[PDB]
Design an enzyme around this catalytic site. Structure first.
Site, PDB file in Angstrom:
ATOM      1  N   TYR A  27       0.779  -1.247   0.000  1.00  0.00           N
ATOM      2  CA  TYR A  27       0.000   0.000   0.000  1.00  0.00           C
ATOM      3  C   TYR A  27       0.825   1.320   0.000  1.00  0.00           C
ATOM      4  CZ  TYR A  27      -4.106  -2.896   0.284  1.00  0.00           C
ATOM      5  OH  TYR A  27      -5.083  -3.815  -0.015  1.00  0.00           O
ATOM      6  N   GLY A  29       2.574   3.569  -1.828  1.00  0.00           N
ATOM      7  CA  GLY A  29       2.725   3.785  -3.297  1.00  0.00           C
ATOM      8  C   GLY A  29       1.325   3.956  -3.874  1.00  0.00           C
ATOM      9  N   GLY A  31      -0.341   1.200  -5.478  1.00  0.00           N
ATOM     10  CA  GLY A  31      -0.886  -0.154  -5.503  1.00  0.00           C
ATOM     11  C   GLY A  31      -2.321  -0.432  -5.139  1.00  0.00           C
ATOM     12  N   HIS A  47      -4.018   5.302   5.454  1.00  0.00           N
ATOM     13  CA  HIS A  47      -3.945   6.573   4.706  1.00  0.00           C
ATOM     14  C   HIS A  47      -4.827   6.519   3.435  1.00  0.00           C
ATOM     15  CE1 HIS A  47      -1.907   9.765   2.148  1.00  0.00           C
ATOM     16  NE2 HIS A  47      -2.111  10.435   3.271  1.00  0.00           N
ATOM     17  N   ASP A  48      -4.760   5.400   2.696  1.00  0.00           N
ATOM     18  CA  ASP A  48      -5.615   5.250   1.496  1.00  0.00           C
ATOM     19  C   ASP A  48      -7.100   5.284   1.848  1.00  0.00           C
ATOM     20  OD1 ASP A  48      -3.431   4.944  -0.145  1.00  0.00           O
ATOM     21  OD2 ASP A  48      -3.672   2.790  -0.437  1.00  0.00           O
ATOM     22  N   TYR A  51      -8.259   8.791   2.685  1.00  0.00           N
ATOM     23  CA  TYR A  51      -8.501   9.564   1.463  1.00  0.00           C
ATOM     24  C   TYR A  51      -9.801   9.082   0.829  1.00  0.00           C
ATOM     25  CZ  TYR A  51      -3.876  11.897   0.833  1.00  0.00           C
ATOM     26  OH  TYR A  51      -2.767  12.693   0.914  1.00  0.00           O
ATOM     27  N   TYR A  64      -2.738  22.367   1.100  1.00  0.00           N
ATOM     28  CA  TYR A  64      -3.198  22.942   2.380  1.00  0.00           C
ATOM     29  C   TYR A  64      -1.945  23.521   3.027  1.00  0.00           C
ATOM     30  CZ  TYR A  64      -1.225  18.411   3.851  1.00  0.00           C
ATOM     31  OH  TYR A  64      -0.358  17.351   4.042  1.00  0.00           O
ATOM     32  N   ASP A  89      -2.874  13.075   6.204  1.00  0.00           N
ATOM     33  CA  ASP A  89      -1.417  13.097   5.976  1.00  0.00           C
ATOM     34  C   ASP A  89      -0.613  13.122   7.296  1.00  0.00           C
ATOM     35  OD1 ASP A  89      -2.014  13.095   3.312  1.00  0.00           O
ATOM     36  OD2 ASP A  89      -1.268  15.164   2.969  1.00  0.00           O
TER      37      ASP A  89
END
Lengths: 121, 121
Positions: A27, A29, A31, A47-48, A51, A64, A89
Protein backbone atom coordinates in the site's frame (compact mmCIF):
# COMPACT_ATOMS: atom_id res chain seq x y z
CA UNK A 1 -0.62 17.17 -2.15
CA UNK A 2 2.63 15.12 -2.10
CA UNK A 3 4.50 18.42 -1.63
CA UNK A 4 3.00 18.90 1.86
CA UNK A 5 2.76 15.12 2.68
CA UNK A 6 6.42 14.51 1.56
CA UNK A 7 7.56 17.41 3.83
CA UNK A 8 5.77 15.95 6.93
CA UNK A 9 7.26 12.54 6.01
CA UNK A 10 10.82 14.01 5.84
CA UNK A 11 10.35 15.99 9.04
CA UNK A 12 8.97 12.99 10.95
CA UNK A 13 11.05 10.09 9.63
CA UNK A 14 14.19 11.59 8.06
CA UNK A 15 13.27 9.62 4.86
CA UNK A 16 12.21 10.96 1.44
CA UNK A 17 8.59 10.04 0.51
CA UNK A 18 9.85 8.92 -2.94
CA UNK A 19 11.38 6.34 -2.77
CA UNK A 20 11.00 5.24 0.92
CA UNK A 21 7.18 5.25 1.16
CA UNK A 22 6.32 5.08 -2.61
CA UNK A 23 7.57 1.52 -3.31
CA UNK A 24 7.07 -0.27 0.02
CA UNK A 25 4.80 -3.32 0.65
CA UNK A 26 1.34 -3.50 -0.84
CA UNK A 27 0.00 0.00 0.00
CA UNK A 28 2.91 2.49 0.32
CA UNK A 29 2.73 3.79 -3.30
CA UNK A 30 -0.27 3.58 -5.70
CA UNK A 31 -0.89 -0.15 -5.50
CA UNK A 32 -4.15 -0.53 -3.57
CA UNK A 33 -4.52 -4.40 -3.27
CA UNK A 34 -3.60 -7.31 -1.02
CA UNK A 35 -2.93 -7.65 2.75
CA UNK A 36 -0.69 -4.98 4.34
CA UNK A 37 2.70 -6.62 4.98
CA UNK A 38 3.80 -4.94 8.25
CA UNK A 39 3.09 -1.96 10.50
CA UNK A 40 4.42 0.66 8.01
CA UNK A 41 2.31 -0.93 5.22
CA UNK A 42 -0.69 -0.78 7.53
CA UNK A 43 -0.05 3.00 8.05
CA UNK A 44 -0.30 3.33 4.25
CA UNK A 45 -3.49 1.25 3.92
CA UNK A 46 -5.06 3.45 6.61
CA UNK A 47 -3.95 6.57 4.71
CA UNK A 48 -5.62 5.25 1.50
CA UNK A 49 -8.85 4.52 3.40
CA UNK A 50 -8.64 8.00 4.98
CA UNK A 51 -8.50 9.56 1.46
CA UNK A 52 -11.28 7.12 0.51
CA UNK A 53 -13.77 8.79 2.93
CA UNK A 54 -13.24 12.12 1.04
CA UNK A 55 -14.77 11.54 -2.45
CA UNK A 56 -15.63 15.26 -2.96
CA UNK A 57 -11.87 16.12 -2.47
CA UNK A 58 -8.67 15.62 -4.48
CA UNK A 59 -5.65 14.83 -2.18
CA UNK A 60 -3.18 14.58 -5.07
CA UNK A 61 -3.79 18.20 -6.14
CA UNK A 62 -5.39 19.78 -3.03
CA UNK A 63 -2.75 21.93 -1.31
CA UNK A 64 -3.20 22.94 2.38
CA UNK A 65 -1.02 24.71 4.94
CA UNK A 66 0.40 23.25 8.14
CA UNK A 67 2.79 24.67 10.73
CA UNK A 68 4.79 23.23 13.65
CA UNK A 69 3.79 24.42 17.12
CA UNK A 70 5.32 23.06 20.30
CA UNK A 71 7.02 20.39 18.20
CA UNK A 72 3.75 19.03 16.76
CA UNK A 73 2.05 19.33 13.33
CA UNK A 74 -0.92 21.73 13.26
CA UNK A 75 -3.22 21.55 10.21
CA UNK A 76 -4.15 25.22 9.73
CA UNK A 77 -7.90 26.19 9.52
CA UNK A 78 -8.93 25.85 5.77
CA UNK A 79 -11.63 24.24 3.56
CA UNK A 80 -13.19 21.01 4.84
CA UNK A 81 -11.20 19.12 2.14
CA UNK A 82 -7.91 20.90 3.11
CA UNK A 83 -8.49 20.14 6.86
CA UNK A 84 -9.44 16.48 6.29
CA UNK A 85 -6.61 15.79 3.79
CA UNK A 86 -4.05 17.45 6.14
CA UNK A 87 -5.33 15.26 9.02
CA UNK A 88 -4.95 12.06 6.90
CA UNK A 89 -1.42 13.10 5.98
CA UNK A 90 -0.47 14.05 9.59
CA UNK A 91 -1.78 10.73 10.86
CA UNK A 92 0.21 8.69 8.30
CA UNK A 93 3.46 10.61 8.82
CA UNK A 94 3.30 10.09 12.63
CA UNK A 95 2.29 6.45 12.01
CA UNK A 96 5.48 6.09 9.88
CA UNK A 97 7.67 7.63 12.60
CA UNK A 98 6.09 5.40 15.30
CA UNK A 99 6.91 2.30 13.22
CA UNK A 100 10.46 3.18 12.09
CA UNK A 101 11.88 0.39 14.28
CA UNK A 102 10.25 -2.26 12.00
CA UNK A 103 10.79 -0.44 8.65
CA UNK A 104 12.61 -2.94 6.47
CA UNK A 105 14.30 -2.93 3.11
CA UNK A 106 12.83 -6.42 2.47
CA UNK A 107 9.53 -4.72 1.55
CA UNK A 108 10.95 -2.06 -0.86
CA UNK A 109 10.05 -2.66 -4.58
CA UNK A 110 7.65 -5.30 -3.50
CA UNK A 111 6.29 -7.44 -6.41
CA UNK A 112 2.65 -6.93 -7.46
CA UNK A 113 1.94 -10.71 -7.41
CA UNK A 114 2.70 -10.94 -3.72
CA UNK A 115 -0.28 -8.49 -3.23
CA UNK A 116 -3.63 -10.13 -4.08
CA UNK A 117 -7.28 -9.46 -3.15
CA UNK A 118 -9.48 -6.54 -2.03
CA UNK A 119 -9.70 -5.25 1.56
CA UNK A 120 -12.64 -2.82 1.49
CA UNK A 121 -12.74 0.34 3.59
CA UNK B 1 -16.15 -5.18 6.23
CA UNK B 2 -14.43 -1.94 7.30
CA UNK B 3 -16.66 -0.14 4.81
CA UNK B 4 -19.95 -1.06 6.56
CA UNK B 5 -18.45 -0.60 10.09
CA UNK B 6 -17.03 2.87 9.13
CA UNK B 7 -20.49 3.82 7.93
CA UNK B 8 -22.19 2.73 11.21
CA UNK B 9 -19.50 4.62 13.17
CA UNK B 10 -20.19 7.85 11.24
CA UNK B 11 -23.96 7.42 11.62
CA UNK B 12 -23.76 6.78 15.41
CA UNK B 13 -21.00 9.21 16.44
CA UNK B 14 -20.96 11.87 13.68
CA UNK B 15 -17.15 11.23 13.52
CA UNK B 16 -15.43 9.68 10.49
CA UNK B 17 -14.07 6.29 11.61
CA UNK B 18 -10.61 6.93 10.02
CA UNK B 19 -9.03 8.96 11.56
CA UNK B 20 -10.98 9.45 14.86
CA UNK B 21 -11.07 5.75 15.89
CA UNK B 22 -8.30 4.17 13.81
CA UNK B 23 -5.29 5.08 16.03
CA UNK B 24 -7.14 5.44 19.32
CA UNK B 25 -5.80 3.97 22.58
CA UNK B 26 -4.36 0.43 22.74
CA UNK B 27 -7.19 -1.38 20.88
CA UNK B 28 -8.86 0.96 18.26
CA UNK B 29 -6.15 0.26 15.73
CA UNK B 30 -4.46 -2.91 14.45
CA UNK B 31 -2.86 -3.92 17.77
CA UNK B 32 -4.03 -5.90 20.71
CA UNK B 33 -2.22 -5.43 23.99
CA UNK B 34 -2.36 -3.84 27.42
CA UNK B 35 -5.04 -2.31 29.56
CA UNK B 36 -7.70 -0.38 27.50
CA UNK B 37 -7.13 3.36 28.18
CA UNK B 38 -10.80 4.30 28.75
CA UNK B 39 -14.44 3.42 27.83
CA UNK B 40 -13.89 4.11 24.10
CA UNK B 41 -10.81 1.89 24.04
CA UNK B 42 -12.86 -0.82 25.88
CA UNK B 43 -15.45 -0.71 23.02
CA UNK B 44 -12.56 -1.64 20.68
CA UNK B 45 -11.29 -4.36 23.01
CA UNK B 46 -14.81 -5.94 23.11
CA UNK B 47 -15.08 -5.55 19.32
CA UNK B 48 -11.81 -7.56 18.89
CA UNK B 49 -13.13 -10.19 21.26
CA UNK B 50 -16.36 -10.36 19.20
CA UNK B 51 -14.40 -10.80 15.89
CA UNK B 52 -12.10 -13.26 17.73
CA UNK B 53 -15.13 -15.47 18.34
CA UNK B 54 -15.92 -15.58 14.57
CA UNK B 55 -13.04 -17.89 13.36
CA UNK B 56 -15.37 -19.48 10.74
CA UNK B 57 -15.62 -15.95 9.22
CA UNK B 58 -13.75 -13.07 7.57
CA UNK B 59 -14.94 -10.06 9.59
CA UNK B 60 -12.59 -7.46 8.01
CA UNK B 61 -13.35 -8.39 4.43
CA UNK B 62 -16.92 -9.85 4.15
CA UNK B 63 -19.74 -7.51 3.10
CA UNK B 64 -23.19 -7.37 4.67
CA UNK B 65 -26.33 -5.19 4.57
CA UNK B 66 -28.11 -3.29 7.28
CA UNK B 67 -31.05 -0.88 7.68
CA UNK B 68 -32.23 1.81 10.05
CA UNK B 69 -35.70 1.25 11.60
CA UNK B 70 -37.06 3.96 13.97
CA UNK B 71 -33.63 5.38 14.76
CA UNK B 72 -31.86 2.03 15.39
CA UNK B 73 -29.47 -0.09 13.30
CA UNK B 74 -31.12 -3.37 12.18
CA UNK B 75 -28.87 -6.09 10.73
CA UNK B 76 -30.53 -7.64 7.69
CA UNK B 77 -30.74 -11.37 7.11
CA UNK B 78 -27.60 -12.47 5.24
CA UNK B 79 -25.31 -15.46 5.74
CA UNK B 80 -24.67 -16.59 9.33
CA UNK B 81 -21.20 -14.91 9.11
CA UNK B 82 -22.71 -11.69 7.74
CA UNK B 83 -25.27 -11.28 10.50
CA UNK B 84 -22.78 -12.07 13.23
CA UNK B 85 -20.15 -9.65 11.76
CA UNK B 86 -22.89 -7.02 11.50
CA UNK B 87 -23.93 -7.52 15.13
CA UNK B 88 -20.27 -7.17 16.34
CA UNK B 89 -20.04 -3.88 14.41
CA UNK B 90 -23.44 -2.57 15.62
CA UNK B 91 -22.48 -3.22 19.30
CA UNK B 92 -19.14 -1.32 18.90
CA UNK B 93 -20.59 1.66 16.97
CA UNK B 94 -23.30 2.03 19.66
CA UNK B 95 -20.62 1.66 22.34
CA UNK B 96 -18.62 4.55 20.79
CA UNK B 97 -21.73 6.78 20.83
CA UNK B 98 -22.66 5.90 24.42
CA UNK B 99 -19.09 6.90 25.48
CA UNK B 100 -18.63 10.07 23.35
CA UNK B 101 -18.79 11.91 26.67
CA UNK B 102 -15.33 10.59 27.65
CA UNK B 103 -13.59 10.44 24.24
CA UNK B 104 -10.19 12.16 24.71
CA UNK B 105 -7.99 13.64 21.99
CA UNK B 106 -4.90 12.63 24.03
CA UNK B 107 -5.49 8.96 23.08
CA UNK B 108 -5.49 9.64 19.32
CA UNK B 109 -2.22 8.60 17.55
CA UNK B 110 -1.40 6.50 20.66
CA UNK B 111 1.97 4.73 20.37
CA UNK B 112 1.64 0.90 20.61
CA UNK B 113 4.86 0.72 22.67
CA UNK B 114 2.84 2.23 25.63
CA UNK B 115 0.59 -0.92 25.39
CA UNK B 116 2.03 -4.07 27.14
CA UNK B 117 0.51 -7.35 28.43
CA UNK B 118 -2.17 -9.80 27.16
CA UNK B 119 -5.64 -9.10 28.57
CA UNK B 120 -7.88 -12.19 28.14
CA UNK B 121 -11.25 -11.97 26.33
Amino acid sequence: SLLEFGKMILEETGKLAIPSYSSYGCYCGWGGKGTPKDATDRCCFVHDCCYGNLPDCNPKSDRYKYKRVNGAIVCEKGTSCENRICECDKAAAICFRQNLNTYSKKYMLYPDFLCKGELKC
